[PDB]
Design a protein around this ligand. Structure first.
Ligand SMILES: NC(=O)c1ccc[n+]([C@@H]2O[C@H](COP(=O)([O-])OP(=O)(O)OC[C@H]3O[C@@H](n4cnc5c(N)ncnc54)[C@H](OP(=O)(O)O)[C@@H]3O)[C@@H](O)[C@H]2O)c1
Ligand SMILES: NC(=O)c1ccc[n+]([C@@H]2O[C@H](COP(=O)([O-])OP(=O)(O)OC[C@H]3O[C@@H](n4cnc5c(N)ncnc54)[C@H](OP(=O)(O)O)[C@@H]3O)[C@@H](O)[C@H]2O)c1
Ligand SMILES: C[C@@H]1CN(c2ccc(F)cc2C(F)(F)F)CCN1S(=O)(=O)c1cccc(-n2cncn2)c1
Ligand SMILES: C[C@@H]1CN(c2ccc(F)cc2C(F)(F)F)CCN1S(=O)(=O)c1cccc(-n2cncn2)c1
Lengths: 260, 258
């Protein structure tokens, strides 16, 4: 945990992966990383929009910028990609897991395909990616950034499948963090709990069925700062006070009462 | 408010009932004269459980054997079990894939397996049982853990799956409130319980004070019977108090208005 105020320069020449960076917040994090002269590798399924993104990262000031098109549904591609992007940058310092499968707001009936798909993409691919990135992150004492949500901390309706995977992220990576402490692994693990963010995808699914969205740009920055400064958790949401209710002191105690 | 006569003639499914807490719940339900259908992989042991349940005063007691790794078996087990009992009033989800206490070592197969068995099958069982439960205005009782509420080392995959249950079943619980579906969801957060599988997994390394599996089962059963939302059961009273999370409830309401 860096006891320090953030400075863009922290990312100058840092080698960073960003998943789900063909649109929404993943696109935003790429630009910010570009301006800070970082080496970026972005990924997603659409090779078209990815190029558009790479094109722009270069001209913003990236030290380098590549895209690799694939689907995170394919566990063999997740592993490969991370090695491909390892080659492209000569190492890895930060791993930003951002991508999610196409979700929408709907009551849950019998959609067991979507529940499994959600786990596989939103959660299980993160673990694979992580296993593949770890050898290189350990070398650079780097960081894992996992993007999550309010729905991954508290229960809302119409996002059950989605919320289940985000909860799963919390439990797994939090437990891994604890393991890196005991195991003395020096790789930071940052979990970001985002409220409604005004991405193209989000605003479509929400409209009509009535809240307030936060800017995707500041949002992308906040994620990157929490990562750079190696914080445990990062909160972001339109309301400030909202962010205050998310931390759980009781969870903090129960976690200690059984360490020793 | 609880009284064993609440289960009298209640059609109940208990999963992972061949051993540990599953076994103990069947026995409790069998003293209350519930109709009971149990399951697990081992028929040899499931038979021993089924006979004992009848000696105890079970309205009826049968087993159907299979691995919950098989979503097909899981979907059929619930039809077959409901058809046999002429209905379902309570669904006790309690089985988990064999787990040991270990640091993560890139064993993704184990993570996938844990999600599949400990979590996705719970949803398949639920989808299959829902119609009968909407019909009996009954209950779903999901059995979870402290490691499904807070982070510990040595139980990553086990932890992700238990967290998954909370996020899914808590979200659908809120969905059933606005759909007026009348079926309760009870998430049970249990600390260390003295089942044989638990005590061989921990006692090696550092250990704790293990609550009694028999009482634990009854608490699970009562909780569901009273249609509570959560149920905490641990040796310490200092645990129960901390497990509750008041901020969450406030956020849940705050953005529920929508
Ligand atoms: N925006 C919000 O309101 C909000 C709120 C809470 C949490 N979050 C979290 O913030 C992150 C981004 O939200 P977002 O609105 O920016 O998502 P988004 O706008 O829908 O874009 C998601 C990204 O995932 C990629 N993707 C989709 N399917 C994929 C697959 N099978 N394999 C690989 N990549 C895939 C998409 O590119 P392609 O489809 O072209 O492959 C896209 O780049 C997510 O983790 C979400 O959980 C967002
Ligand atoms: N005991 C604890 O320390 C503790 C603490 C917190 C939470 N819990 C929760 O309490 C519940 C029971 O724990 P427990 O101590 O009673 O475990 P247990 O005693 O070892 O019983 C596990 C049950 O699951 C069955 N099972 C295993 N694999 C299966 C599969 N692939 N498909 C279907 N069934 C399978 C086992 O029978 P077969 O092998 O013959 O199939 C057995 O009946 C679990 O949800 C656990 O997470 C326990
Ligand atoms: C609603 C947003 C955007 N979602 C999202 C993100 C990217 C997508 F591509 C699609 C979505 C989704 F369709 F789920 F909205 C995922 C869920 N989140 S959230 O967890 O930040 C959140 C905040 C506040 C309230 C809620 N509520 C849910 N029900 C009621 N309130 C959810
Ligand atoms: C360790 C026990 C028994 N486990 C269990 C249940 C059934 C099994 F079949 C196997 C296990 C397990 F191997 F995880 F022990 C599941 C996990 N739990 S727990 O969530 O009740 C718990 C309470 C307090 C501390 C911990 N810690 C774990 N590491 C550090 N603290 C876990």
């Amino acid at each position: 945990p860096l006891n320090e105020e953030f400075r863009p320069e922290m990312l100058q020449g840092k080698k960073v992966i960003v998943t789900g960076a063909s649109k929404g917040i993943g696109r935003e994090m790429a630009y910010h990383l570009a301006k800070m002269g970082a080496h970026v590798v972005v990924t997603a399924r659409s090779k078209e929009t990815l190029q558009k993104v790479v094109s722009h990262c270069l001209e913003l000031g990236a030290a380098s910028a590549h895209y690799i098109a694939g689907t995170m549904e394919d566990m063999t591609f997740a592993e490969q990609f991370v090695a491909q992007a390892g080659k492209l940058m000569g190492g890895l310092d930060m791993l930003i897991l951002n991508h999610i499968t196409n979700t929408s707001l709907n009551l849950f009936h019998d959609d067991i395909h979507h529940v499994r798909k959600s786990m596989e993409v939103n959660f299980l691919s993160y673990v694979v990616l992580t296993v593949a990135a770890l050898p290189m992150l350990k070398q650079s004492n780097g960081s894992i950034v996992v993007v999550s949500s309010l729905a991954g901390k508290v229960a809302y309706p119409m996002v059950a499948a989605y919320s289940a995977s985000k909860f799963a992220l919390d439990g797994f990576f939090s437990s891994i963090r604890k393991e890196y402490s005991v195991s003395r692994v020096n790789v930071s693990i940052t979990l970001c709990v985002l409220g409604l963010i005004d991405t193209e995808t989000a605003m479509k699914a929400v409209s009509g069925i009535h809240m307030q969205a936060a800017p995707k740009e500041e949002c992308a920055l906040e994620i990157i700062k929490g990562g750079a400064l190696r914080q445990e958790e990062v909160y972001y949401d339109s309301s400030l006070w909202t962010t205050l209710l998310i931390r759980n002191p009781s969870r903090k105690i129960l976690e200690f009462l059984y360490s020793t």
